[PDB]
Paper text:
SAT synthesizes O-acetylserine from substrates l-serine and acetyl coenzyme A and is a key enzyme for regulating cellular cysteine levels by feedback inhibition of l-cysteine, and its involvement in the cysteine synthase complex. Using X-ray crystallography, we have solved the structures of NgSAT with the non-natural ligand, l-malate (present in the crystallization screen) to 2.01 Å and with the natural substrate l-serine (2.80 Å) bound. Both structures are hexamers, with each monomer displaying the characteristic left-handed parallel β-helix domain of the acyltransferase superfamily of enzymes. The six active site residues in N. gonorrhoeae comprise of Asp96, Asp161 and His162 from the left monomer and Asp147, Glu170, Arg196 and His197 from the right monomer, with His162 and Asp147 forming the catalytic dyad.
A trimer is present in the asymmetric unit but a hexamer can be generated using the crystallographic two-fold axis. There was density to support placement of substrate l-serine in two of the three active sites, with the third having weak density, where serine interacts with conserved active site residues. The model has an R and free R of 0.234 and 0.267, respectively. Density is present for extended and folded C-terminal tails in the NgSAT + l-Ser structure (one closed and two open tails), but as a result of poorer resolution for this structure it was not possible to build the tails into the density. There are no major conformational differences between the l-malate and l-serine bound structures (RMSD 0.236 Å), where the main differences are due to the presence of open tail conformations in NgSAT. Comparing the two NgSAT structures, the active site residues, Asp96, Asp161, Arg196 and His197, interact with l-malate in a similar manner as the substrate l-serine. The terminus carboxylic acid group on l-malate and l-serine are co-ordinated by the Arg196 side chain. The negatively charged carboxylate side chains from residues Asp96 and Asp161 both co-ordinate the l-serine backbone amide and the hydroxyl group in l-malate. The most notable difference in active site coordination is where the l-serine γ hydroxyl forms meaningful hydrogen bonds to flanking His162 and His197, whereas in the NgSAT malate bound structure the equivalent carboxylic acid group maintains a hydrogen bond with His197 but is orientated away from the catalytic His162, and is co-ordinated by the backbone amide of Gly188. This difference is likely due to l-serine being a natural substrate of the enzyme, whereas l-malate is not.
Residue numbers in the entry:
A (entry chain B), D (entry chain B): 3 to 8, 11 to 189, 192 to 247
B (entry chain C), F (entry chain C): 2 to 7, 11 to 75, 77 to 189, 191 to 224, 226 to 249
C (entry chain A), E (entry chain A): 3 to 7, 11 to 248
Write the structure that this text describes.
């Protein structure tokens, strides 16, 4: 029972986690607290992100409420979350259940955390946004600037070392592997703009204010420095069509 | 340097740690608790790994007991010792055996994965995924529990190492940080199979269900095809060059 | 109002007072980390101990150790002040001085390494290795305590930086994340790069072996240098080639 | 501006704590998190009790939600809380502000914690009630059995060592000092029944299923073993009119 | 189904399985504390270490220390089993055996003291004092490690119990909270009460000095005994007097 | 027994703690951190008190700095030493000076109150109340910050000690656990004033604004009237008897 078959994402996740809780008594109270006691997927996400990023400095209850108010202020974030989960199930062979990336894929956590961060930054809570950016970098190994604008349908697989700068913009239905850099090169627009459908391979660098066309493919380890036409595969250092 | 290439690994480690404990009073109770109070190397490893990966969610006592019950698989301890010896052999920055045991996160990631693999094969999949995620957070190393790892492994520096579900590694292999043993929507074998003796340089990507031959040499390269034994491949994309 | 227009410490205190007044969630944190301190170095010791403290190593003890270290070599504080200024110069994402001080893990990794180097030279090797491992865990940055780093350093984003035992870095250098200053061989001795003043290294660049990198050279992103590089040369490719 | 003068309890507490937060920068984020960010007194109470009684075993977020749902299920508990605060302001010379016992009087915390405990016990959550009873005993030094029934207007001053058994019942507007025992003497009714208005002195023992009349006064250190008529002062070991 | 109608351990495991199934908030806690263990003594060591552990003293280390202690003197476990049965006998509020095991701080204080006494006799005096202080903080109960306690003990409610260095308690005794088994004088030696089998002491009763309390005596609540008490006598008052 | 009645308190404490640290490896890093790494007794006291009373809300580093800045009042350290000597004099269970310093919660409650009193007089009332509540939770001792305490105090066992806002205690006093120095709606002086040399037995209640004379002796008694000097009072209610 999946979305490319039948469907309720939330109900399916609850059934999966109920099975898991019954199977592993070591984690049951965790799964009841993180998931089963909640009434919406967004509440679960806020709770788990607060567990990940909480500190003595930033109480987990306070961060939980902040993420809850954020998700309730911006309804589109929950839509993006659900889209990303569906994308991970579609594209990742290692994903056999929906709760799997929800609970255990640090790239998914980094992306959704950034979404909330972006919401806080736009509201003027810049200091808190920087605090959470630093904490996301520490715990997830992923540095996304709060100003970065990311679309829906994103899968950040493995994730370790992903960087996205202040002025980066990503379209919808994009797949990024670990080690990828969407880096800069004086302020202003200076970070990549990635189009819908693009797939970026592991340890690929995309530098500067350059456009990457729809359904382009950036090979693993490549270094892109100029714009890339849509539907082109570029490979090499520097990358070439 | 009374070492294995000049012997009791466990006794040597205990002597090193006794010296350290006497020297640094800030860490002595730590070294007594992690090492000196234990009767076997495997118990020390379980204790330290649980210290690293423990959380409020997962009590350190429970994780310690789980790792000891796992260590059921006596051969894992053998692999641990092998890996330690390899690190002493191959790493110039390793002058003592307790050094990687306590402070090298690549060694910790590899041994943690070994225990994880044991838990996964026994059907404790949820805990295996939980611990995989925690290994990724604390060590910066993502090894899928299904991955099959041989003995004599050295993962130096480690930050960013990835190994997918279907990856298989032989014996006496040396991997640097940033290395990717990655895949290429459809399941099945899709992660590299690395042969005994191979050396992979930093930030090297090996993608897909491809075989890497005995004593091959792969820094920064991107392999997409199989590699014959005893070949040095370099470049993006990789090409034989030696 | 910046250093190119000045007291770094006073400016940082003003910025942090503004932030504390703005965010009530973080006010006590900013008062404890910054406003209650009398010197920038004390703030640095406090924040680093907050980052790297553990149940094994009490934060009060690590704080005192970092304080005694900074007092042992006053010049370390100078380097700290240099590095902050460098980031303000070179990083477009840096609009305030307390920003990297509090939230840039590369800056924290560099200063932590400085203190580590001080402890290692004093013979506190076990603690140096402990803190190296902890820096690797929390920051994702592996710098060997023996590594020699000059002033004016910016380690942007930082995740995955590695620098071995015999690495030496000059002054006014800019390094991005994923960069490797790595070694070669099983035999000890000089085997890690020596980077000259002014060099810029792009993301995920590997520099391997006991090789010299000349003044104001530029190592392109993703490049792999295995030979020495003349001064004022841009090298690109795998392996890197002059251009 | 007090209740025996003018009045909004909640607004007054918020003003007091805003003053405190502005005065002590060491505690400001605490006072914003415990009080100023909340919309009702009951939410503040749930939060602070969760801070007190939270553990690694029992996450503070989970306990916070449990106390919130409890207070929302039983509206009378909040009324009792407000009554108790007013009683402490009335009767305790050391209470010059309303937020003072709210945040810093462990007897007040023990009483309100017990109220929530009683709610959980009546709902059948007996194991959780026992867990929280043990934790209240550890942190507050106060052992109140979850089944005990306590009225409103209670002040438990200093509190250390207060004990109240399974079948104890306390009326309204009662004042109890530290060390007081409402103890037993085979099951069944075996714990005191205390009437409205009674004042019990420090280290006084009241043992058995005995009635204590309205507006009685039990002297400090006394040991009561028989019923006490209303409006009588009893003192001694054993206590005598 | 109780011990007066039997396996204590099996009954406790059944009770805790029921509780775990009933309360999902506490299931992993009950599995870790009880169900994953193979003996009651292991459960006791685990729970006591949970109570008394700290950042200074790792819970794994304290757990191992309590385990080794219990293994050093198997008879301690017998006393534990005795005490639990006593509470079930004597406490109306006890309807299950795991109830005092998990939630009665007097039971925890008594068993903690037993292990403490074992460590003290073995010469681990510094740790014994550490754990005495920690027991005093968490349980509100001060028992000197040298104190000698028999089996069949019920310390109900417990808050404020004190027993000095030279105190000795027989078997099958019932003590309420606030009770003092205290000393007198600045000179060491025997100076703390010796209580005989069967005695019942009421809440906030003080028994001071090196005085013997006879078999099956009853010390009324709030009483202050300063002289020896004959067996099978009820004493009441301040100071206590026969009745 | 090289002691003060047979001298350097600080050096003796350091020697005792060095012996203990060498003997118990489980606590050595603790004893080095709490005591041996410090240069003065007052710093040790600030460190240990912050360890006891620290929380996630109140960082131990901040509380440590606050206690050191308080200790501004040099005389407090004198009182600390006096109290320690008293405990050695009067308590048979005290054979070493570091014993109450590290493990006697009555000593900790008294010294914590001293610092609290200093903070309260300086106007840091909110923090004083916070720390009073924490002292009540951790030590089971409720001392109002306004309470005025003399030197040479021994609070043995301590659990349940209460001292109200207007209480005043002289010098060289011995108090057992459960003792109440309580009050009796209207503010003003309403808590006992205890004279030098007095001894109060366990679970004794002294209520109201009443004077207790020099070298008076009060276990379980309830005093409601003033007590002349050099009188033993016993009973509920209390009566002179010796």
């Amino acid at each position: 029972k999946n979305h490319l078959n039948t469907f309720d994402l939330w109900h399916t996740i609850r059934e999966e986690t109920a099975a898991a809780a019954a199977a592993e008594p070591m984690l049951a109270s965790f799964l009841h607290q993180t998931v089963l006691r909640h009434e919406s997927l967004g509440s679960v996400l806020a709770y788990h992100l607060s567990s990940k990023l909480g500190s003595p400095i930033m109480d987990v209850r306070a961060l939980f409420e902040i993420y809850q108010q954020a998700l309730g202020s911006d309804t589109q974030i929950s839509k993006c979350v659900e889209a990303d989960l569906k994308a991970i199930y579609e594209r990742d062979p290692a994903c056999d259940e929906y709760s799997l990336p929800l609970l255990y894929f640090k790239g998914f956590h980094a992306i959704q955390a950034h979404r909330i961060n972006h919401r806080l930054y736009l509201d003027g809570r810049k200091t808190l946004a920087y605090f959470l950016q630093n904490r996301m970098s520490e715990v997830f190994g992923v540095d996304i600037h709060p100003a970065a604008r990311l679309g829906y349908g994103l899968m950040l697989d493995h994730a370790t070392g992903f960087v996205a700068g202040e002025t980066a913009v990503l379209g919808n239905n994009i797949s990024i592997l670990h080690g990828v850099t969407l880096g800069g090169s004086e302020g202003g627009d200076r970070h990549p703009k990635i189009g819908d459908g693009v797939m970026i391979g592991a340890n690929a660098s995309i530098l500067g204010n350059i456009r990457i066309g729809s359904n382009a493919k950036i090979g693993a380890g490549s270094v892109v420095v100029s714009d890339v036409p849509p539907s082109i595969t570029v490979v090499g250092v520097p990358a070439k069509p």
